[PDB]
Design a protein around this ligand. Structure first.
Ligand SMILES: Nc1ncnc2c1ncn2[C@@H]1O[C@H](CSCC[C@H](N)C(=O)O)[C@@H](O)[C@H]1O
Ligand SMILES: Nc1ncnc2c1ncn2[C@@H]1O[C@H](CSCC[C@H](N)C(=O)O)[C@@H](O)[C@H]1O
Lengths: 285, 194, 285, 178
DNA sequence: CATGTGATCTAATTAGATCGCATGG
DNA sequence: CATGTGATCTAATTAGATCGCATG
């Protein structure tokens, strides 16, 4: 019979602030949201959609141990480092130790910096996400530096898109079975605007690239409107990813810039499933 | 923890070395005796945390990048990340009061970007070591106080640039530069000799 | 007593269906809303934003007296013909009698076709809009063909932008003063997203062209964001025009394609002021 | 028998020289230019039984675009119509001297709700007419291709009517003779 | 026997400057 | 005399087709 506290979160590679979006969707009170992000479009979405709650600190490599101690303590450390040098979709990927790959170790470093000293049993939770389609030795090393094996959660069972992602962390019930809640839209048709017909029940994985919205090797169009073929609109991608509609409609972004943000982000119901047991550890309503 | 202990209360140093066996240097200064205390690890890619702990406690963790040559089956930053990983595995529990030292040595193998990483993951900038009678140079990161208070002949990175240049061209480690960095630790551990 | 009936509307050059939007916001029941429009983006907006209520009939020159007879009768005929060959902002304007200017006479023709016979006293209302910045002779001829003088209503009095427009028609009280409702956003600051500062109370007239977003002849940016000068975003234009936010976030349209639709449209509060007295003539929710 | 004199309003063109050659305080009213003519003007000019308007020939002294004449024609044609209770006949005549182009021709047929009958003469030029009179649409005439007249019009531009009287004649059966 | 939090090239936009002058304020 | 339901021109920047092969 003790009263829990609002959560303090350090979010690295914050993107379009999916983490804060879900924490609010769960009723978890948030005392501090410190985000390291470098993309100005990303930052603008977070700043606007969360009304200046997020505190931005810039490049993850500008964040020292001294900063962690001043800004902390933290109860939650989350992030997913860039995968453009890890994913096997890229034939020119520079790997875990080069290019953007090595930005993973900045997560490892700040996580070490943010951990409670042994003997301190205060609640501390962390989550790290990346792609399944990476080299076997890069998944080996990531698990070696995090000292955990990951959980494979495919967004297909709670959304309208395939998205097989790895999840390292210590959140409670991380491997419990996923369950399609009634606020998930499991089929593409339920994500489309009025007057449009889905040609597929579920779309393949949506990257930052336009060829990922067309289906298969034959590049099939996903939707019929007026008996004419068409690709997904931005608002349909947002629903496929679980975001509120028009979430990314900021900053005069083109539809490709919006897809750039969405294609790097997390599937919202997947995270919501992962963050859900946190509301038993922190203040709510 | 920059304090010393009386000569009679000093135990033999236990040393974990990675990517390099430094047994010869430390016995040559009498840190080890010639009986059959130092663990050198093969391939750190699969050494977990329990392994470092089961290898007994360590008072010093040493890591080095291989010198200018064609041994790099791995990228030059791999050795530094791996060193930092196993280094945290080998730190003692916050209760322990004994002296704990670490050291990472670079032989001009890391370029400007990899060096900024090194200084960021070890929270200190390296110290350059010049070899005059100029033939070589090393950069060193360590918590050893006398390597941060004594100052050898400061040389600019553009000068190391050029020798880095001449070291590429002519292509073992310069132990003469390495040996002096262990000098101020015999004031902390047990001495031995022939 | 005799109960009032839902309104039946012929909407020429419907654009993004402002007319149906304002009628719905007034509570006026709409039995049918037949719209003449050719631009695919415009039709897509109206189709999506009004769930297929709109009856699209294509080019205004394809609409015959026979069609008016079959599809009618109509209680309300509205439209505003293209102005690119009328407004003095185009040095190459081809005038009222050529280019797109001659599409005005199509409004004049379908209006005649839809008017009740003399002796028929059924309620019939119509409204024609165009820009103030046209030629003396062209404005003279429009009033000759519609047999009425226009009323000048500037949107600056009920919104955050200058938009001086002429309005020909027979709606009750077209010359009554304009009052600001509390739903009107009078200053630019009230239309901006969080974190952004307005440099002007009111902005100049917004056309389809980007130079109309920057102010003065010196092309001043209208907004500050973290001390950086910026132009208005799409959602901010929508608020400046009085539309729902993200109204035009349809069909993967770029900000310029969204600005093409908005810069040709009506100021929503102005139309609401013009349509409000229709509530006493037709059925309402 | 009881056939009162004709009442003709003519626009852009005074046809009196072939109006009394046809033999019909003048009944014919002629408007200077129509740009400021309104309904009360046409109304107080008394009832009309035929309203006439035409395009100038290919040539100068025109300061107006070719479709200006039509729209203005159409405008005052409606000004002159009588109420449905009025039993008297009513005819209207628009007629082009090959100045309208293909885009301007479709506007003509769409605003007048019928397509033109063409009138040729070779021995000069050719002419198209829109009108409700059942003696120019229904009376069978020499058929000329649209590109025949296209080529004759190019030959007319290179180069620089009794058929305008031949079309006015058949109204004599409804009005007074000579 | 597919598959992909991508990238490299092309043709395809836009970003922005610039032009325009009749008009009624 | 400041203004404008637009249009042209052309760098500098994006859109979209094809390209990968390790891995699950
Ligand atoms: N040096 C750096 N410091 C901080 N963030 C960086 C960075 N380099 C890349 N990033 C950001 O890391 C992100 C990884 S993609 C992950 C975004 C997040 N999962 C979401 O839901 O939106 C990208 O947004 C990229 O802009
Ligand atoms: N031939 C034609 N037939 C019907 N509509 C046409 C047309 N030519 C152009 N248009 C349309 O006429 C419109 C004039 S702009 C007026 C838009 C409307 N008032 C709104 O509030 O949105 C444009 O949308 C243009 O696409």
């Amino acid at each position: 019979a003790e009263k829990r506290k609002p959560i303090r979160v350090l979010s690295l590679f914050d993107g379009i602030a999916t983490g804060l979006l879900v924490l609010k969707d769960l009723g978890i009170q948030v005392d501090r949201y410190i985000a390291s992000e470098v993309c100005e479009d990303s930052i603008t979405v977070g700043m606007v959609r969360h009304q200046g709650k997020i505190m931005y600190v810039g490049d993850v490599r500008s964040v020292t141990q001294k900063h962690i101690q001043e800004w902390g303590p933290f109860d939650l450390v989350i992030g997913g480092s860039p995968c453009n040098d890890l994913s096997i979709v890229n034939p020119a990927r520079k790997g875990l130790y080069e290019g953007t790959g090595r930005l993973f170790f900045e997560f490892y470093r700040l996580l070490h910096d943010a951990r409670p000293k042994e003997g301190d049993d205060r609640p501390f939770f962390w989550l790290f996400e990346n792609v399944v389609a990476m080299g076997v030795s890069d998944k080996r090393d990531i698990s070696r530096f995090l000292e955990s094996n990951p959980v494979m959660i495919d967004a297909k069972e709670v959304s309208a898109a395939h998205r097989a992602r790895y999840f390292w962390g210590n959140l409670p019930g991380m491997n419990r079975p996923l369950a399609s809640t009634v606020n998930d839209k499991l089929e593409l048709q339920e994500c489309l605007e009025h007057g449009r017909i889905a040609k597929f029940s579920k779309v393949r994985t949506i990257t930052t690239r336009s060829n990922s919205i067309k289906q298969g090797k034959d590049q099939h169009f996903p939707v019929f409107m007026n008996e004419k073929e068409d690709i997904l609109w931005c608002t349909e991608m947002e629903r496929v990813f679980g975001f509120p509609v028009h979430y990314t409609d900021v900053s005069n972004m083109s539809h490709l810039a919006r897809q750039r943000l969405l294609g790097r982000s997390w599937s919202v119901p997947v995270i919501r499933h992962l963050f859900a047991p946190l509301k038993e550890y922190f203040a709510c309503v | 923890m920059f304090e010393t202990v009386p000569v009679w209360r000093r135990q033999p140093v236990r040393v974990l070395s990675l990517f390099e066996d430094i047994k010869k240097e430390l016995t040559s200064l009498g840190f080890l005796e010639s009986g059959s205390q130092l663990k050198h690890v093969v391939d750190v890619t699969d050494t977990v945390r329990k392994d470092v702990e089961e290898w007994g406690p360590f008072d010093l963790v040493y890591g080095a990048t291989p010198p200018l040559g064609h041994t790099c089956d791995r990228p030059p930053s791999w050795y530094l990340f791996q060193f930092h990983r196993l280094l945290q595995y080998a730190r003692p529990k916050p209760g322990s009061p004994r002296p704990f030292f670490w050291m990472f040595v670079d032989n001009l193998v890391l370029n400007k970007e990899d060096l900024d990483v090194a200084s960021r993951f070890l929270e200190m900038e390296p110290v350059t070591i010049p070899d005059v009678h100029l033939q070589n140079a090393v950069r060193v990161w360590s918590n050893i106080p006398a390597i941060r208070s004594r100052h050898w002949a400061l040389v600019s990175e553009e000068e190391l640039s050029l020798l880095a240049q001449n070291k590429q061209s002519s292509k073992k480690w310069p132990t003469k530069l390495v040996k002096n960095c262990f000098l101020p630790l015999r004031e902390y551990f047990k001495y031995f000799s022939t």
